[PDB]
DNA sequence: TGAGGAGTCCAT
């Protein structure tokens, strides 16, 4: 069977799962990157994490 | 498959299929071939007229 | 080894080395064996010895074999491995057996309840990393390219003066040995940081659960 | 005199 985008015709797009300390740190710098020198620009971001906690 | 928001499953059965059919994994050339089946190769060979070649 | 056996609440020790203690050094293996037994007879306990933990035993015999012994029988376990081999496969864990329990595992988390219960390593021995200089086996020219890459890279950052760089390059062109290449890299400052990186990673991978002992 | 080893991808 071949499903279609019409299945998502009515869907909830503005509700997301409750955040964590590790996703705000990802999101906010990127948002500061689109404001100045944005629209079309890359970014190298090294994230120092640790085994254990859910990287 | 098993993500729930506020105690209710986040994705219905039909939505999961659409999302799960959009990801591709690319192995070696020597492991992509042995993963296939006789029917697939026979279908392709007759579909392009390659069986007659020596 | 002697320090580990004479412990009340430890049953798992892993010795990270630089070489594989396989049958090619069989005699040496046997020499340790009857030593352990002797110590194992002094303090009343039965110890398990695991030899030959390479990439050809974790994919042909199974690592789970070790884990089972820690939740189906009593004893201490000593395992011999290397740095590179332990960098692949991950998660050397046994879950639980409260009948076999050493009367205490303190939970460390605050707000969690795990579906199952698992623990990790409680004793490790660290040797000196060796052979910290990249090399290539494909063909004979590729090795030369790699070596010259590293020399020029060290010159740029500021660890090597031009005078030393020319001497090293000249002798490499004429021909040297690996054991004389390793003696000139040890005089720089990158070696220190590389050794520290190895130690930090090897220790960081040694913990993945929330059930811990008291004395490590 | 100088140091001491395993582990890996992919197209031919």
């Amino acid at each position: 069977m071949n499903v279609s985008i019409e299945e998502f015709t009515h869907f909830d797009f503005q509700l997301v799962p409750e955040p964590s300390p590790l996703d705000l740190v990802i999101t906010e710098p990127l948002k500061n990157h689109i404001e100045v020198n944005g629209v079309k620009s890359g970014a190298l971001l090294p994230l120092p994490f640790q085994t254990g906690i859910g990287k | 498959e098993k993500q729930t928001v506020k105690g209710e499953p986040r994705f219905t059965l039909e939505q999961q299929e659409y999302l799960k059919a959009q990801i591709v994994h690319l192995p070696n050339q020597s492991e992509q071939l042995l993963q296939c089946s006789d029917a697939v190769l026979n279908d392709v060979l007759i579909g392009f007229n390659l069986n007659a070649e020596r | 080894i002697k320090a580990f056996i004479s412990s009340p609440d430890n049953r798992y020790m892993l010795s990270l080395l630089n070489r594989t203690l396989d049958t090619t050094r069989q005699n040496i293996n046997d020499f340790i064996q009857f030593c352990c037994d002797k110590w194992a007879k002094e303090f009343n306990v039965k110890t398990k010895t695991f030899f030959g933990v390479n990439a050809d035993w974790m994919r042909l015999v199974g690592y789970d074999e070790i884990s089972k012994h820690l939740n189906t029988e009593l004893g201490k376990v000593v395992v011999f491995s290397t740095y590179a081999s332990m960098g692949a496969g991950k998660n050397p864990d046994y879950a639980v057996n409260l009948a076999l329990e050493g009367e205490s595992l303190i939970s460390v988390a605050d707000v969690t309840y795990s579906t199952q219960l698992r623990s990790d390593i409680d004793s490790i021995y660290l040797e000196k990393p060796t052979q910290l200089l990249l090399s290539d086996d494909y063909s004979h020219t590729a090795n030369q390219l790699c070596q010259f890459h590293q020399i020029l890279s060290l010159q740029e950052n500021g660890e090597l003066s031009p005078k030393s760089a020319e001497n090293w390059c000249r002798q490499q062109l004429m021909g040297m040995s690996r054991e004389r290449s390793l003696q000139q890299y040890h005089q720089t400052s990158d070696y220190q940081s590389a050794v520290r990186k190895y130690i930090e990673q090897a220790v960081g991978r040694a913990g993945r659960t929330s059930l811990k002992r008291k004395q490590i």
Side-chain angles (χ1 to χ4, degrees):
Chain A
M1 65 179 288
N2 190 235
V3 298
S4 301
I5 297 169
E6 290 285 70
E7 182 65 26
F8 284 79
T9 290
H10 291 296
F11 187 70
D12 199 280
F13 285 123
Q14 293 179 356
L15 166 61
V16 298
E18 199 210 0
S20 178
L22 311 193
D23 63 358
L24 294 174
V25 65
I26 299 186
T27 54
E28 297 175 358
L30 268 183
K31 299 311 175 303
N32 189 359
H33 177 71
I34 301 299
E35 290 169 54
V36 65
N37 50 291
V39 175
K40 293 293 303 178
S41 296
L44 188 153
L45 185 51
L47 286 151
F49 274 9
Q50 194 185 304
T51 290
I53 297 89
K55 68 181 178 67
Chain B
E1 293 179 353
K2 322 294 188 55
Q3 190 175 57
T4 49
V5 159
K6 292 181 181 179
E8 165 77 54
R10 194 201 171 151
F11 288 119
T12 51
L13 213 67
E14 69 275 16
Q15 288 171 354
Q16 298 178 57
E17 286 176 0
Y18 171 70
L19 283 197
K20 265 173 33 162
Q22 283 215 301
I23 316 177
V24 292
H25 168 229
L26 309 188
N28 274 301
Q29 308 196 310
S30 312
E31 183 178 1
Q32 183 66 41
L33 172 44
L34 308 155
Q35 168 175 348
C36 291
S37 66
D38 291 331
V40 167
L41 283 72
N42 273 295
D43 189 358
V44 176
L45 288 181
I46 315 181
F48 286 69
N49 304 299
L50 294 174
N51 49 307
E53 323 178 309
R54 183 177 292 171
Chain C
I1 298 174
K2 182 175 174 66
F4 168 59
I5 294 176
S6 183
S7 77
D9 294 359
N10 296 115
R11 63 181 293 165
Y12 182 76
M13 174 178 174
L14 183 63
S15 300
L16 287 187
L17 311 181
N18 290 318
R19 68 224 69 176
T20 300
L21 293 182
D22 65 303
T23 61
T24 61
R25 287 163 276 243
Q26 189 84 65
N27 293 61
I28 297 169
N29 280 353
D30 317 311
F31 167 43
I32 311 163
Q33 179 77 68
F34 51 66
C35 294
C36 177
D37 303 354
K38 184 189 62 59
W39 287 313
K41 285 179 297 183
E42 175 187 6
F43 322 118
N44 302 300
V45 76
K46 280 73 176 175
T47 59
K48 179 63 188 178
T49 58
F50 270 129
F51 293 121
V53 193
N54 64 7
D56 207 3
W57 175 95
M58 282 175 48
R59 300 180 304 178
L60 190 78
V61 169
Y63 198 65
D64 63 358
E65 171 178 60
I66 302 192
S67 169
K68 181 267 290 180
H69 189 291
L70 287 195
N71 58 289
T72 312
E73 182 65 26
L74 294 174
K76 296 176 187 300
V77 182
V78 183
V79 180
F80 292 164
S81 313
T82 74
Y83 267 117
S85 43
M86 185 64 73
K90 288 160 174 53
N91 289 35
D93 284 357
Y94 71 114
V96 298
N97 194 0
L98 294 174
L100 294 174
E101 182 65 26
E103 65 183 1
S104 188
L105 294 174
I106 297 89
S107 167
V108 176
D110 49 296
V111 65
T112 61
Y113 75 113
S114 296
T115 77
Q116 209 182 3
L117 281 198
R118 304 211 151 211
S119 182
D120 63 358
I121 297 169
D122 63 358
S123 298
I124 62 170
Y125 159 66
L126 312 179
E127 183 178 1
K128 183 144 196 171
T130 62
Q131 302 269 7
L132 282 72
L133 183 63
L134 278 61
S135 59
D136 199 329
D137 64 39
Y138 183 101
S139 291
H140 184 249
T141 313
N143 188 59
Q144 303 279 302
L145 291 180
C146 172
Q147 295 298 109
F148 285 117
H149 168 74
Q150 309 175 57
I151 306 168
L152 292 187
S153 296
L154 278 160
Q155 185 181 235
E156 181 171 1
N157 189 359
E159 291 76 340
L160 276 188
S161 56
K163 182 175 174 66
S164 296
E166 293 217 3
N167 189 359
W168 195 352
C169 286
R170 186 170 293 123
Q171 283 145 21
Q172 169 91 56
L173 212 63
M174 291 285 209
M176 294 182 286
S177 57
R178 188 61 197 293
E179 272 76 350
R180 302 221 91 82
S181 298
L182 273 169
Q183 65 183 357
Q184 274 191 288
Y185 178 47
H186 292 175
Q187 296 294 321
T188 45
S189 308
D190 279 10
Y191 177 62
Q192 296 294 321
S193 285
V195 174
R196 266 171 268 181
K197 170 167 155 295
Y198 273 91
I199 294 301
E200 173 175 300
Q201 295 298 109
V203 176
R205 74 180 58 236
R208 297 171 187 241
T209 59
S210 281
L211 287 169
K212 298 294 177 145
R213 292 274 202 179
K214 167 174 181 172
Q215 177 188 55
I216 308 85

